Amino acid sequence: MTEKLKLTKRLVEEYRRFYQVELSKKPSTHAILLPLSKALEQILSVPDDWDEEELILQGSGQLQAALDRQEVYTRPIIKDKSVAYETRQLQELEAIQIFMTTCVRDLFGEMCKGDRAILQEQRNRIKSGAEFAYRLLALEAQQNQN
Amino acid sequence: MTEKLKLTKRLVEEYRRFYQVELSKKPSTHAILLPLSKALEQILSVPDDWDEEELILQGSGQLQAALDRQEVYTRPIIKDKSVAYETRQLQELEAIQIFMTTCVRDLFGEMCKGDRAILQEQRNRIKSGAEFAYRLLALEAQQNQN
Amino acid sequence: MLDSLKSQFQPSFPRLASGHYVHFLMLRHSQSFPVFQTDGVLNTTRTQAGLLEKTDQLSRLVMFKRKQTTPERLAGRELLRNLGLTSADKSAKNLCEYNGEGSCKQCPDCILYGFAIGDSGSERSKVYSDSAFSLGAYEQSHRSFTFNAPFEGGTMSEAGVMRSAINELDHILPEVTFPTVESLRDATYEGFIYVLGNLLRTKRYGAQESRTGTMKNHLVGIVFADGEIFSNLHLTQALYDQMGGELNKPISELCETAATVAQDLLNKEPVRKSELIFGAHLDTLLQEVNDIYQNDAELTKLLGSLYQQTQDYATEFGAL
Amino acid sequence: MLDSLKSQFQPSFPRLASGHYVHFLMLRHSQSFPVFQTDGVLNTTRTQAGLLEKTDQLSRLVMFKRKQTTPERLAGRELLRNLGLTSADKSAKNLCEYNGEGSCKQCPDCILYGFAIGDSGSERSKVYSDSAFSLGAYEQSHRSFTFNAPFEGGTMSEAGVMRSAINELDHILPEVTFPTVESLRDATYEGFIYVLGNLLRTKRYGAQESRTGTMKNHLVGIVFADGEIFSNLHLTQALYDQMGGELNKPISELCETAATVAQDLLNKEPVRKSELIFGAHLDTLLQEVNDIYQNDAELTKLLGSLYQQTQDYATEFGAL
Amino acid sequence: MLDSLKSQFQPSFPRLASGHYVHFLMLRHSQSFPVFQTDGVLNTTRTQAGLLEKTDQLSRLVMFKRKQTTPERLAGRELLRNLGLTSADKSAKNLCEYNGEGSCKQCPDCILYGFAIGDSGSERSKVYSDSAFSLGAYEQSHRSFTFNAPFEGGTMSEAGVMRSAINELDHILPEVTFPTVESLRDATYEGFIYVLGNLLRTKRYGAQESRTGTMKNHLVGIVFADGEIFSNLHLTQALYDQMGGELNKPISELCETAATVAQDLLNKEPVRKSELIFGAHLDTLLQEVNDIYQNDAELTKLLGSLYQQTQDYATEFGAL
Amino acid sequence: ILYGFAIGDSGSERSKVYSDSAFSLGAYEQSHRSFTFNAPFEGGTMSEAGVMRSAINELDHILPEVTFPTVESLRDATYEGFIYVLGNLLRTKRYGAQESRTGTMKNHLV
RNA sequence: AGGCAUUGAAAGCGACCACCAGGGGCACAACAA
């Protein structure tokens, strides 16, 4: 199947589903690509003998335990007052596990061939494309809402 | 799957058999990880100048002593069944001892290389994996019928 | 001593070098818990423990390449600014941005330690380092310390929520020793007093300077030679070999063993060695260099001269 | 030892080469973090692991071609300048610009390592060299280090805004070995001591020489021969197969394994071999070459003779 | 082995051809980054990938027409000068200037590889050679590297003026294979040993021999025939088809496959095949030839005899 | 501006005031004791309502008359910056853990 | 000297930066007989 290429927009929309900042706040690159920076840091930092399925629970837990280190203004699931908080959390933990499995299989495993040296040389380039893709998606929402 | 997926699962399913905060209380990270925190703390707080089998028997007694301070609704192996004191106490002791066999002979001894330095730089990540895995299991066990 | 050595150096910086190396051979003893890190862990590498005996593997800490040149270098720039030979104000004609397009082309820092971006080309360093290694094993030379950062209320809660400013950090212990060689190519006598001055006068290394990383650089030898001598790793392996794998011995004894190993190794290098300053000749040389750096008139004369020597280099051979 | 070998060399450089190769078989061990790069990444290539038993594909680092001749030349040229045989000053009668139009056409570097630009023609190098490969696989032999460059204020934001002074680079680890066979075609005895001089006396390789990339060249044999012996890749693969791929062994054991594979490879070459200098005969050869390079009167006698021989070549057969 | 092969050959060179081809089947493996260029790019051409099955077009590298005969020829001439059968000094009765008048017109190079400059006619090469093709596609088989040439002061600016010396060159990767048949017409037995000697004793091929282009020639068969067997492109396309393009196989499995595709093709050629030296008979014959080329008495006798044969030919039928 | 800061989009500034870790002049075995501490139920006993709540452990505390020689430093200051920094050194007294109960010290400037 | 009782909650980082300039052919040989 095709998933050996063309990943980057789905990778960003899959975290934009649970974490956001508006470009009207004039945010840092560090505040835009925050979820992907935690995911790539976890993949590259933990010992290289560990394989895919242990990384996902660790990297998701590194990202749930780091978005709860920030303001509910940035969480467009936990901020929906229409829903009971345990069911906000059931949605939150399935968004993070679905993003972070795309970061461990699709990004690291397929797009970077599962090699930490290939991932490391092109980390800054991957990140850059996610910052631009985030802005591109932010400029879609104001189009569909008007 | 086995070589780290079963290790990273059983690391929490072996404490869920003897320790459970029910998640609707919205409990702390410190309250969920109470077995693994005191197991990894007991493993780092002594050097490898004496053996893993001495470490299990001293550590299992310490973990069973900390859960003698817990309220009984947190110990499912005493709360969730009605059977004689000496037999429910023996199964609770063998669940505590077997959890401490994986924690020393697989998590510390193989996955952390048997080396305190690579475990110590990794505690926050193996804690965040175990944190995430506990909620991923507990909220699945609660909500999979919905 | 220095009155004899003036003869060994060049009269002005040359266009290309000529094999007039001077090597400073030193032990850098840790005090006050240093941090040498790059990716959030202390830097370590697997190595052979010794040379002939003690062939077994040992992981040792590494003071990675730049972390030992740039503390020296910046302590030099500050002295050039105390003496008024270079400046920090953007209105001044002798301004020197450290790292930028904005750099001077002509101060002692730029011509000795080198520069790279700009339109006026670039200049390779005349002072040469390499990464330096702990004489001991990493397991017996580090400890990790928890740190916290609470609210001024003396608590980790301000609204009854927890502040989450907790982590632990890996620190190198005191009395850990990194054996090092820095080497200098085709300098003048005043340039030698500038870089030697930096080795002696700079004390703080690595991360978090404001709180840790004070070090005792004991200079062990100064060797004038026709080429470069042994690596830092080869000196650490030779010194662990000679110390018998029992490094847990006094700091003066470790310095005298290093003087004895350095001279043993120098006899095996295919370089002419004009002058070898060890023992009482080094203790006397250091004391009269320590005298230069304590007398305001001599230090201002010597470093004023280096400035000119380097403005001349810049205008004759450098970035004009 | 060397008193016997003068019989095997040519008495002066010949117009065309008549098959008098001297080969230097050596292990280049990393000491501290070299950077062997082109196009902004460590050069690495896929190869068979070893010749016959270990037949899996294996990515290994490549010390690409010039990166192990250029340090040899530039250390030699500096010695020609210390000895005053050549000069750096643009007025002088014995000037040699490197790698430029104003190159000398008659000094020992020019005849032994060659030149090409300008009207007087070109000369091919008498020193022959090859790309060298890491004995181990790339994944166990490199590490990536991040680096930053703060403003001298000790911050990344002195201007009130972040510097953009942060990126990462890949460096080869210590104890990584690159097997190599340099060759010298039709030299004099004095040319042999000059080229062997460089191999034993040069220490720095790759990018960032001023900060990194010290290496320890262990010469494991010298072989006088009627032709060219094995490629670097073939020696690398033969030594990996001889080590059974368990490369985590002491450097001294790797050097005797290198000697004892190299002799078995030499037995399979359609080349007459006149003097295979290995082991205890190489130790006494290298100790005799050291006591040339350690002695002022002996080195200046010997390399001056090379100058004349090379001048004579230039004015009889070369560039005139 | 060679003691039986002596029968197949003719006793002296004839004036007109008489059949009697010997075909040297080779795989040439790259070992270290060859450059095979004309006009500043790697020579490359579009061809069908393989004969019957994988009939898609594919671009492959071309080891062009001379690049696989001048290395052989010049290495044999060096041997003729080492053995003293020819000389390179002017005012000697056995001179052989390459590519001029004053080519010897009597030595084994002049007779086997031909001459055509000046008075006294021209001689057709008895060694017949061809352009060879990479078994793999150009995209899997090359890389571009950048080359710099900084000033000797260690940077790409010399007075703040930049140095215009950065280009890139394309080089063929290691372990890429070039299938070949080179062919010898009307040789004597010593002439066969000379030509075979050149094929086993040569090691460098491309541009920049001084730094690059070591190769490993595996002779995979020797076939005695009345005339020319399949083309070089045809062996390459047959070998590619036999693997289906699964070319990432170790070099022994690749040489053993080449021996079997070569025997399949020989059975479809309208040529009487007197002798087919393959496998255990070939790795005995190669050993018996290594025993000649490692022995001064055998080699001086054998090529001295060729000299007479080629000189006899010169005075009876050739230029004398 | 004197002791430094780092979180924010506004920048960071390194401390002008420099410290080491300080070390005890005497050895550890001559300069500490470990003290038991217990936390009863305020009815005055370890029985909470019929069964003991456990709250006794020991903690290790440095003795009085133990000296930590130290050298602080301040760079590129103004005179009023020195009056602030020397002031803080002279005026503050509560150093360690458990400020509310212990770790009063006297800094003697020598 | 006894019974007893060796802890307990929480927190597990946070911000920003992921480069910068300048070089990108230089010399000659285009047939020899």
Author numbering:
A (entry chain J), B (entry chain K): 1 to 146
C (entry chain D), D (entry chain C), E (entry chain B): 1 to 320
F (entry chain E): 111 to 220
What is the paper's account of this structure, in its own sentences?
To investigate ssRNA binding and single-stranded vs double-stranded target discrimination by type I-D Cascade, we bound type I-D to a ssRNA target containing a protospacer that matched the crRNA spacer and performed cryo-electron microscopy. Our efforts resulted in a structure of the ssRNA-bound complex at 3.1 Å resolution. Overall, the structure is strikingly similar to the double-stranded target-bound complex. However, in the single-stranded target-bound complex, we lose recognizable density for the PAM recognition domain, likely due to the flexibility of this subunit in the presence of a single-stranded nucleic acid. We propose that the lack of a distinct dsDNA PAM in the ssRNA allows the PAM recognition domain to remain unlocked and inactive (PRD disengaged). Our structural studies revealed a flexible PRD in the ssRNA-bound complex, which suggests that the type I-D Cascade does not require PRD engagement with a specific protospacer flanking sequence for ssRNA binding. Indeed, binding of a ssRNA substrate containing either a 5′-AAC-3′ PFS (corresponding to the complement of the GTT PAM) or a scrambled PFS (5′-ACG-3′) showed nearly identical binding with an apparent affinity of 11.0 ± 0.9 nM. We observed no binding to a non-specific control ssRNA that lacked complementarity to the crRNA. Single-stranded target-bound Cascade has a flexible PRD (PRD disengaged). Based on this structural analysis, there is no indication that AcrID1 binding to type I-D Cascade would affect single-stranded nucleic acid binding, consistent with SIRV3 being a dsDNA virus.
Interestingly, the type I-D system utilizes subunits that are homologs of type I complexes, type III complexes, or both. The type I-D operon contains the type I signature gene cas3 split into its two domains; the helicase domain (Cas3′) encoded from a stand-alone gene, and the HD nuclease domain (Cas3″), which is fused to the large subunit as part of the core effector complex. The Cas10d subunit is bigger than other type I large subunits (Cas8) and similar to type III large subunits, yet retains the type I functionality of discerning PAMs in target DNA sequences. As is typical for Cascade complexes, a repeating, helical backbone of Cas7d subunits assembles around the crRNA, while the C-terminus of Cas10d and two Cas11d subunits constitute a minor filament along the belly of the complex.
